[PDB]
Write an enzyme that holds these catalytic residues in place. Structure first.
Site, short mmCIF file in Angstrom:
data_model
loop_
_atom_site.label_atom_id
_atom_site.label_comp_id
_atom_site.label_asym_id
_atom_site.label_seq_id
_atom_site.Cartn_x
_atom_site.Cartn_y
_atom_site.Cartn_z
N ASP A 1 0.78 -1.23 0.00
CA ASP A 1 0.00 0.00 0.00
C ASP A 1 0.82 1.29 0.00
OD1 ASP A 1 -1.89 1.94 0.37
OD2 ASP A 1 -2.87 0.94 2.06
N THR A 2 0.94 1.92 -1.17
CA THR A 2 1.70 3.15 -1.27
C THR A 2 1.01 4.30 -0.54
OG1 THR A 2 0.63 3.68 -3.38
CG2 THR A 2 2.75 2.53 -3.46
N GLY A 3 -0.27 4.11 -0.24
CA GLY A 3 -1.02 5.15 0.45
C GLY A 3 -0.87 5.10 1.96
O1 LIG Z 1 -8.68 2.47 3.06
C1 LIG Z 1 -7.99 1.95 2.16
N1 LIG Z 1 -8.57 1.38 1.07
C2 LIG Z 1 -10.01 1.35 0.90
C3 LIG Z 1 -10.43 2.45 -0.03
C4 LIG Z 1 -9.83 3.79 -0.25
C5 LIG Z 1 -10.46 4.70 -1.26
C6 LIG Z 1 -11.65 4.24 -2.00
C7 LIG Z 1 -12.24 2.91 -1.77
C8 LIG Z 1 -11.61 2.03 -0.78
C9 LIG Z 1 -11.99 0.66 -0.35
C10 LIG Z 1 -10.62 0.13 0.18
O2 LIG Z 1 -9.69 -0.27 -0.86
C11 LIG Z 1 -6.52 1.94 2.27
O3 LIG Z 1 -6.06 1.11 3.47
C12 LIG Z 1 -5.77 -0.32 3.32
C13 LIG Z 1 -7.07 -1.09 3.13
C14 LIG Z 1 -7.19 -1.92 1.93
C15 LIG Z 1 -8.37 -2.70 1.65
C16 LIG Z 1 -9.53 -2.67 2.59
C17 LIG Z 1 -9.44 -1.82 3.82
F1 LIG Z 1 -10.55 -1.76 4.77
C18 LIG Z 1 -8.19 -1.04 4.09
F2 LIG Z 1 -8.09 -0.19 5.31
C19 LIG Z 1 -6.13 3.39 2.37
O4 LIG Z 1 -6.54 4.06 1.11
C20 LIG Z 1 -4.69 3.55 2.54
O5 LIG Z 1 -4.03 3.25 1.28
C21 LIG Z 1 -4.41 5.05 2.98
O6 LIG Z 1 -5.45 5.99 2.46
C22 LIG Z 1 -5.07 7.30 1.94
C23 LIG Z 1 -4.73 8.23 3.12
C24 LIG Z 1 -3.37 8.80 3.15
C25 LIG Z 1 -2.93 9.69 4.21
C26 LIG Z 1 -3.84 10.04 5.31
C27 LIG Z 1 -5.21 9.48 5.32
F3 LIG Z 1 -6.14 9.81 6.41
C28 LIG Z 1 -5.64 8.59 4.24
F4 LIG Z 1 -7.03 7.99 4.21
C29 LIG Z 1 -4.34 5.19 4.49
O7 LIG Z 1 -5.33 4.96 5.21
N2 LIG Z 1 -3.15 5.60 5.03
C30 LIG Z 1 -2.94 5.79 6.44
C31 LIG Z 1 -2.24 4.60 7.08
C32 LIG Z 1 -2.40 3.16 6.83
C33 LIG Z 1 -1.57 2.19 7.60
C34 LIG Z 1 -0.60 2.70 8.58
C35 LIG Z 1 -0.43 4.13 8.83
C36 LIG Z 1 -1.27 5.07 8.06
C37 LIG Z 1 -1.32 6.57 8.09
C38 LIG Z 1 -1.94 6.94 6.74
O8 LIG Z 1 -0.98 6.98 5.65
#
Ligand SMILES: O=C(N[C@H]1c2ccccc2C[C@H]1O)[C@H](OCc1cccc(F)c1F)[C@H](O)[C@@H](O)[C@@H](OCc1cccc(F)c1F)C(=O)N[C@H]1c2ccccc2C[C@H]1O
EC number: 3.4.23.16
Lengths: 99, 99
Positions: free
Chosen positions: A25-27
């Site tokens: 996860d690059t996000g």
């Molecule tokens: O919710 C997700 N996908 C879901 C999604 C997103 C957009 C549209 C649809 C869908 C559905 C699913 O794929 C992703 O999580 C994995 C994940 C994957 C599948 C099902 C899940 F349940 C799930 F959690 C999520 O998009 C992460 O890539 C990332 O989001 C962007 C972001 C960036 C910075 C601050 C934020 F606040 C923020 F949000 C994120 O939450 N980053 C935070 C993080 C994560 C781990 C440790 C530390 C930190 C801090 C911060 O970077």
């Protein structure tokens, strides 16, 4: 290897002698794994995602193998929906985004 | 280009005639942008990530430009903390993870 994104970039990781599936996860700034037991003391951390924040336990200098690549870094453990390999470890394995 | 992950992979996107900053997020299945006005009808949807779910508005067939690359796909709009370019659009620009 080169991983396309038509499907979730799920890979096998090895931690604590166990195989688990995790998402590249690059996000994600950090790496967070589902509830599990890790050695040593932990520190508290709050991480915010799309739906809000969750409290996790921070373990440092943890050995984790990702697709055969050995990494040693900070791993968070908490109520995450899926195992996430974040940028802290993605950088260790030399992962980059390309297009 | 090749994007390293030492810092968040933020890029400039163009949508609805507006320039916005967004995160190339391989962990996101869909693309979700902060509240904004988009043309056409929309459908309500619930998306879940770390912290839980948020309600967003789903718009289809939206044109977006990511780093000069034109892509078409579904775009969700809602209370997301950051603009997210998910897999549904990353695939269209030929984005891959490499290590
Ligand atoms: O919710 C997700 N996908 C879901 C999604 C997103 C957009 C549209 C649809 C869908 C559905 C699913 O794929 C992703 O999580 C994995 C994940 C994957 C599948 C099902 C899940 F349940 C799930 F959690 C999520 O998009 C992460 O890539 C990332 O989001 C962007 C972001 C960036 C910075 C601050 C934020 F606040 C923020 F949000 C994120 O939450 N980053 C935070 C993080 C994560 C781990 C440790 C530390 C930190 C801090 C911060 O970077």
């Amino acid at each position: 290897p080169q991983i396309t994104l038509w499907q979730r970039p799920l890979v096998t990781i090895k931690i604590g002698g166990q195989l688990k599936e995790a998402l590249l996860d690059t996000g994600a700034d950090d790496t967070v794994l589902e509830e599990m037991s890790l050695p040593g003391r932990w520190k508290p951390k709050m991480i915010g995602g799309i739906g809000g924040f969750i409290k996790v336990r921070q373990y440092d200098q943890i050995l984790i193998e990702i697709c055969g690549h050995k990494a040693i870094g900070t791993v968070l453990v908490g109520p995450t929906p899926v195992n996430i390999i974040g940028r802290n470890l993605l950088t260790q394995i030399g992962c980059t985004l390309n297009f």
